[PDB]
Amino acid sequence: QAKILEADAEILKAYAKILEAHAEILKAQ
Amino acid sequence: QAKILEADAEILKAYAKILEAHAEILKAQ
Amino acid sequence: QAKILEADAEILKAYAKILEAHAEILKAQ
Amino acid sequence: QAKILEADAEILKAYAKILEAHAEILKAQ
Amino acid sequence: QAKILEADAEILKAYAKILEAHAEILKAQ
Amino acid sequence: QAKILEADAEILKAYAKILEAHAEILKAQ
Amino acid sequence: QAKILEADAEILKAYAKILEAHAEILKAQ
Amino acid sequence: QAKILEADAEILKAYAKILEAHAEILKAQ
Amino acid sequence: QAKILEADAEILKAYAKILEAHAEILKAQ
Amino acid sequence: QAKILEADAEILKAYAKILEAHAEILKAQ
Amino acid sequence: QAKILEADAEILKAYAKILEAHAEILKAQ
Amino acid sequence: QAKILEADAEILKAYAKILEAHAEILKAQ
Amino acid sequence: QAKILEADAEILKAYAKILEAHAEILKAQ
Amino acid sequence: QAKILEADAEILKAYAKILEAHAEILKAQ
Amino acid sequence: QAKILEADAEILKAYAKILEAHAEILKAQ
Amino acid sequence: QAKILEADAEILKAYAKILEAHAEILKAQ
Amino acid sequence: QAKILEADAEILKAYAKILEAHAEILKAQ
Amino acid sequence: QAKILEADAEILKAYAKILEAHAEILKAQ
Amino acid sequence: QAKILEADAEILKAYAKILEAHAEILKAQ
Amino acid sequence: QAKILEADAEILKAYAKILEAHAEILKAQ
Amino acid sequence: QAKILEADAEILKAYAKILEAHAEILKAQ
Amino acid sequence: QAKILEADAEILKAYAKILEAHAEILKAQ
Amino acid sequence: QAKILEADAEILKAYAKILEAHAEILKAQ
Amino acid sequence: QAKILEADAEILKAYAKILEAHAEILKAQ
Amino acid sequence: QAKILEADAEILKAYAKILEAHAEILKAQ
Amino acid sequence: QAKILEADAEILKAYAKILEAHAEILKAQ
Amino acid sequence: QAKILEADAEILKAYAKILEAHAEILKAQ
Amino acid sequence: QAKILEADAEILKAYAKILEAHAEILKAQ
Amino acid sequence: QAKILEADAEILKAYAKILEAHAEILKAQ
Amino acid sequence: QAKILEADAEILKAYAKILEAHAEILKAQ
Amino acid sequence: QAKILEADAEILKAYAKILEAHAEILKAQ
Amino acid sequence: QAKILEADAEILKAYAKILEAHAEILKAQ
Amino acid sequence: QAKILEADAEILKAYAKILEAHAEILKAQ
Amino acid sequence: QAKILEADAEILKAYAKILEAHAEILKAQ
Amino acid sequence: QAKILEADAEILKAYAKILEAHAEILKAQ
Amino acid sequence: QAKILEADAEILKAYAKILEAHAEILKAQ
Amino acid sequence: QAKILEADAEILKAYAKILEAHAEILKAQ
Amino acid sequence: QAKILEADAEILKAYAKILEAHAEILKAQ
Amino acid sequence: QAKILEADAEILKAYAKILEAHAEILKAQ
Amino acid sequence: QAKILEADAEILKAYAKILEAHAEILKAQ
Amino acid sequence: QAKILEADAEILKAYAKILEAHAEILKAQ
Amino acid sequence: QAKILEADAEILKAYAKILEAHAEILKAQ
Amino acid sequence: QAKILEADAEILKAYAKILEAHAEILKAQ
Amino acid sequence: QAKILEADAEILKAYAKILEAHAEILKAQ
Amino acid sequence: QAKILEADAEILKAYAKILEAHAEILKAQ
Amino acid sequence: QAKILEADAEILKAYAKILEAHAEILKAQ
Amino acid sequence: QAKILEADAEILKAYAKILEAHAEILKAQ
Amino acid sequence: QAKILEADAEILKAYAKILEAHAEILKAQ
Amino acid sequence: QAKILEADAEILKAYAKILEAHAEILKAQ
Amino acid sequence: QAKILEADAEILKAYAKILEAHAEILKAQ
Amino acid sequence: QAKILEADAEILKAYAKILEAHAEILKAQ
Amino acid sequence: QAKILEADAEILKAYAKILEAHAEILKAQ
Amino acid sequence: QAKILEADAEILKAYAKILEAHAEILKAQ
Amino acid sequence: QAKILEADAEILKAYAKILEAHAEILKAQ
Amino acid sequence: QAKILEADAEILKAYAKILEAHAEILKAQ
């Protein structure tokens, strides 16, 4: 079951990388 | 069982990285 | 089922790389 | 049993990182 | 079914590489 | 047995970091 | 079915290599 | 046996950090 | 049908190798 | 034997830090 | 029909190898 | 043997720091 | 032997700091 | 342990509600 | 654990709504 | 140790209630 | 899990709308 | 040692009660 | 999952429109 | 040495009682 | 999937138009 | 040296009694 | 798929035009 | 696919023209 | 409690500084 | 609570500095 | 709340520094 | 909210620095 | 929004540095 | 938006450094 | 657009370094 | 276009390094 | 085009290193 | 063309290394 | 032609290595 | 011709290695 | 002819290895 | 005979690793 | 004979590691 | 012969490490 | 011959380290 | 010849370290 | 020749360190 | 030539350090 | 808080009017 | 906050007018 | 914000006019 | 933003005129 | 932007004229 | 940009004239 | 670009003349 | 380009002359 | 290029003469 | 060298005697 | 050199005697 929660954390970490990239866009403007 | 709790900690750390990314957006604005 | 969620994370990570590339475009201008 | 208590400490440290990120949100505003 | 979503991730990663290449052109000019 | 008491100290240090984060929020308000 | 999408990804990766080569020409000048 | 007493000192130091954090709250209010 | 699109990717990769060869000429001059 | 007495000194020093933290609480009020 | 497009790709790859040999001749001068 | 007497001095200095902390409370009241 | 007498002086200086701490208590009252 | 995951679901639903309120208030702008 | 995935769906739908409102406000510009 | 995890569930539920009240007060604004 | 994939579809459709608005606004320039 | 963990549970439950009262008083605001 | 590939087609059509507008502006130059 | 740990348990229980009284008096406000 | 290949055709046609405009502007030089 | 540790236990028990009486007085307020 | 091959023909014709203009401008040199 | 072969003929004719101009400028040297 | 009365004295001293500044205005005319 | 009265005294001291500055204006003429 | 009143004092102190600057101008003339 | 008022104080402090610079000009003349 | 007002303060501080530089010119003459 | 105003402040700070450098020439003469 | 203004600031900072170097010559004479 | 202005800044920075080197010569004489 | 100006900067930086080397000779004499 | 100017910079950098070597000779003497 | 100038730079770099070696002799004596 | 000059550089680099070896002898003495 | 000069360089490099071996003897003694 | 003495050194080094492991045990307790 | 003396040094260094391990034993207690 | 004296130095250095380890034991007591 | 004297210096430096170790013993007692 | 005198200086520096160690012995007694 | 006189200075500096060490003995006695 | 005179100054400075060390002896007696 | 920023705008507009009057009166001189 | 930026524009325009008056009055000199 | 950049252009043009008048008056000298 | 770059051109042209007048006045000397 | 590079050409020509005047005035010496 | 390269040629010719005059004046010595 | 290489030849000829003057002046010594 | 190689020949001949004069002055020694 | 090889021959002959003079001066010793 | 190994045997025998005394004194405890 | 190794044997025998006397004293305790 541990890999399921690990994949959940990977999903949310990917979401965090999305928001960091969007931040880097908005900083670059 | 310790890997399950470690995965819980990774979930909440991912949530913290989400909130830090959102703060990075709002700081950049 | 964990590989399905891993593939979801790969999709969103690819999306993050898209926005990072768009950031690098707009920063290079 | 030490790894169980270490995982508990990791959980609460992640919670502290959540609250610090919320502080970053509120300070950035 | 995971190979289908993996192929989707490969498609979007290829599109990200397209945008990085276009960034390489625009940076090189 | 010393690692158990070390883990106890890590638990209480994590709790102290929670209260410091809460203080950082309340100072930032 | 997934091999078709893999071939699509190969097409777009080839396009990315085209644009990288064109960038290499333009950088070399 | 010295590591046991050292861990005891770490426990009480953690409690002192808790009380300093609570003081930091009550000063911040 | 996948071999057709694979051959298309081979065509465009050959064109990319042409452009890299032209780059190697222009760099060597 | 010296490390045992050093750990005793660390215990009482931690107790002193506890009382200084309590002093910080009572002073900040 | 895949062998026809494969032969086209081989023609263009041969042209690229011609161009790379011309590059090596020009570089060695 | 000098480290033993040094640790004795550390013990009594720790007791003095306890007593100064209690002094700091009683002054702060 | 000089470090032994130095440690003796450290012992008596620690006792003097105890007496100064008790003095600071009685002054603060 | 299921209460932890249910609380994680409540946290993420609250984050979704905050993002929806942010969405409608940027829609109003 | 399906509540976690449904909350992820709500989060991603909220991000889609934010991006749609951003699309409308860039259409207005 | 289950009391610790249940208290963690109570803590995260309280944080969810705080975030829900924050969502309502941003809905009112 | 189809809600997640439909949310991905909404995300990419919103990105397509943003790219179309960027396309027409570079057409206007 | 189990008394220490039970005291940790009591501490975290009290922190949860404080956070619940803070949630209620922010609900009243 | 056909919505995902349809959104990919919309993305690629948008990239085609951007490249066509870039072609028109380089025609004007 | 178990008396030290039992005294630590009594200290932490007293801190829990103080926190519970603080929770009650913030509930009364 | 015919929309994907049609968008690929549009992309390569746009690249052909860009290369034709580049050929014309090198003819002008 | 066990007298020293027993005296430490008596000290910490006295501090626990002081904190308990402080808890009762704050309960009375 | 014939649109893809026609676009390949357009790309190769554009490359031929670039090479012809390069041949003319080296004829002028 | 006759357009592809005709474009290959145009490419090779352009390479022949480039080699002819290079041979003429080597005759001039 | 002494810090409270000290703060009261600081308030009244600030008030005395206000009246001294008012005397400075009335003298300076 | 003492920091609140300290801040009140800081407000009044700032007001006294305003009146001293206005006095120094009026004296400076 | 103490930081709010501290910031108020900083506002009025900044106004006092403005007034002293105007004083120094008028004295300099 | 405190950072907003702090930024107001920074604005007016910058204004005071402007007037002191004008004073330094007028004194230097 | 605090970073916006901070940037305003940075603008006016840069203006003050311009005026101090002009002062240093006129003093140096 | 804050990066734009920060860049404006960098422009004016660069102007101030130009002016101080010109002052350095004029002082050195 | 921020990188363009940053590059402008870099241009004027380079000009400032030019005048500082010229001042360093004239001071060195 | 940002890299063009960046290269302009590098040109003028190189010129400043020339002048600093000439200063170092004239200082060393 | 940016690499051309970068090469110009490299030329002038090489000239600066020439003059710094001549400074090293003339200082060493 | 850029590699030619890069080679020019390499020539002058080698010349600077010659003069630095001559400086190292004359300094070592 | 670039490799010829690169070889010239290699010749002069070799001469610089000769002079550095001769310097290292004269330093070693 | 470039390989001839490269061989010349190899000759002079061999001479430099000779003098470095001679220096290593003279340093070793 | 380049291999002749390369063999000359190999001769002198072998001579350099002779002198380095002689250095190894003279250092080893 | 050197390998015999080397083996003696390996024997005593193994004994040292035994005692280090025993210290690692006793430290870990 | 050098390897014999080196082996003697290895023996005594192993003895030093024995005494350092015994120091680790005695320090750990 | 230099390796013999070097081995002698290694012997005496090993003896010094023995005495340093013995000092480390005697300090640790 | 310099390596012989260097080895002599290594011998005497090892002797100095012996005396420093014996000093560390005598200081540690 | 310089390395011989450098080795002489190393010999006498080693002798100075011997005398400093002897001094540290006689001071530590 | 400068390294010879530098080594002479190092010899006499080592002699000065000898005399300072002997002074440190005689001061320590 | 400057390094020769610098080495002369280093010789005489070393002589001055000799005389100051002899002063340390003669003062310490 | 918008009244504060509006009053800041009025202040800065008044400073602009004062600077315009100063510009006019220096135009009259 | 746009009034603040417009007031900054008025301020900088007034500074430009002052600099133009300084320019024409140095033109008159 | 275009008024800010336009005022920057006016400031830089005024500085250019000042430098032109300085160039004229140094031409007259 | 072309006004900014045009003002930069005017600034650098004015610096060129100043350097030309300096060149003329050093030609006259 | 060609005015910028033309001004760079004027700057470098002015530096060449200054260097030519320095050359002829060292020729006159 | 040919003016830049011609100015570089003028710079290097001026440096050549400076070095020739330096060669003549070292011929005179 | 041939002017650059010709100026390089002039520079290297000047360095040859400097080395020849150094050669004859060491011949005269 | 042959002027560069001829200048290299002049440089190497000058180095040969310097080495020959060094050989003569070592023959005289 | 034969001048380069002849200069290499002169360099190697000069090294032979230096080694012969070294052989004679070691024959004299 | 047999004296050295016999001294090693005496050293290890003394260590065995010390360990036997430690063994019997832990037997008595 | 046998005197050196014999002195090493005497040193190690003395260390063995010191360890034996230490063993006899630890036996007496």
Author numbering:
A (entry chain U), B (entry chain O), C (entry chain a), D (entry chain I), E (entry chain g), F (entry chain C), ...: 1 to 29
N (entry chain FA), O (entry chain LA), P (entry chain 9), Q (entry chain RA), R (entry chain 3), S (entry chain XA), ...: 101 to 129
From the reporting publication:
Here we report seven high-resolution cryo-EM structures of filamentous peptide nanotubes based on a cross-α supramolecular architecture that provide insight into the designability of helical peptide filaments. A structural interaction is identified based on an appropriately placed pair of arginine residues (RxxxR) within the corresponding peptide sequences. This local interaction motif, designated as an arginine clasp, is robust within the context of these cross-α assemblies and can guide the coalescence of helical protofilaments into structurally defined cross-α nanotubes. In contrast to most structurally characterized filaments based on synthetic α-helical coiled-coils, the chain axes of the helical protomers are oriented in a plane nearly perpendicular to the long axis of the assembly.
In order to better compare the two models, cryo-EM data were collected on a fresh preparation of Form II filaments. Helical reconstruction afforded an atomic model at 4.2-Å resolution with a different helical symmetry (i.e., a rise of 1.93 Å and a rotation of 124.4°) than that proposed for the original model. The higher resolution model of Form II is consistent with a parallel orientation of the inner-outer helix pair, which was suggested but could not be unambiguously determined in the previous analysis. A structural comparison of the two assemblies indicated that helical protomers were arranged in four (Form I) or three (Form II) cross-helical stacks (i.e., protofilaments) that self-associated laterally to form single-walled and double-walled nanotubes, respectively. The main distinguishing feature between the Form I and Form II assemblies was the mode of lateral association between the respective cross α-helical stacks. Each nanotube was derived from coalesence of three protofilaments derived from the dimeric protomer. However, these were arranged in different symmetries; C3 for 29-20-2 and C1 for Form II. The main difference between the structures was manifested in terms of the lateral interactions between the termini of the protofilaments. These interactions occurred along the direction of the left-handed 12-start and 11-start helices for 29-20-2 and Form II, respectively, as illustrated in the the helical net diagrams of the corresponding assemblies. Among all three structures, the helices within the dimeric asymmetric unit could be superimposed with only minimal differences. Structural overlays of laterally interacting protofilaments indicated a conservation of the interfaces between the three filament structures.
